[PDB]
Amino acid sequence: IVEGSDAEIGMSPWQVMLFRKSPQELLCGASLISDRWVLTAAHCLLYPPWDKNFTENDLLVRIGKHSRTRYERNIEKISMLEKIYIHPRYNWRENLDRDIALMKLKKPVAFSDYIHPVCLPDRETAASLLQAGYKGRVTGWGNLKEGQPSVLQVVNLPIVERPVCKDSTRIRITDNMFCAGYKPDEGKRGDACEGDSGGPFVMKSPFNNRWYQMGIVSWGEGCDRDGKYGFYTHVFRLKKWIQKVIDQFG
C-alpha cells in the first residue's frame, strides 16, 4: 500500500494473509467470505508467464493478523487449504480477465474480535455503491513504494469513470474489472502495490451499515504513478460463479 496509514486493531477482520511454507514468505492478500471460504486473485496462485503455479500443499492461510512478521499467538489462526478453485475463463495470457479464485479451508475457522467475514454485494448494493467518485478501501502488507510495513496498511481510494480507466492503459479492459485512484489534478495519492494482490477493495453501505467487498486487488502499471490507476476484479459481476462453487462444493 503506497501512501497509506496503519490499520487499527480489528479494522479489517476479513483480511487474510496467503503465506508460503518453503521459503517462509508473504504471497498475497485474500479475504474471509464465510467460516470455510477464502477469496483471492487467481494470479496469486497461477501465472504461467512468471512460472507461478502454487498448489494447496504449498501454502497456508493466516487470518486475524495485524503485524506482518510476528507469529501473533492467541490472535491469528492458521489454516490448511482443502481445494483451490480458479475461474475457468481466467485470462493470464492477455489482460488478467476474471482474476478471481476461491479456496476451501480444511476445517472451519471460529470467529472472534479479529476474525469475521465481509459481505458479497447484491444488485441493490452494486447499483448504489459502485459509482465514480465514491470511495472504497484497500488493505494489505505489500510494498510501501514501487519498503515493507511492520503493520497492516489501509488507503481510501475513489472509483474512476470507465473512459478514464480505458484511456490510462494500453491493456484491454473488460467489464470484469474496474479502476480506482486519484486523478493527477486531485493532489491526493495512494495505490495498492506488489504484495497487496488478492486483497479486498471494500465499501461500507450507508443504508444497512455493512462492509461489502466490491473488488479484488488485481493489476496496475507501477504503483502510485500519475495518470495511472489500480485495476480491481469486479466482484459483483463474478458473484454468479462464487455462488456456483460454494453451493456445489459445500
Binding site: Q24, L26, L60, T69, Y71, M80
Partner: peptide
Amino acid sequence: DFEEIPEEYLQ
C-alpha cells in the same frame, strides 16, 4: 524477517 510458526502448521 518472519517469525517461525508452530511446526504443527508445516507438517
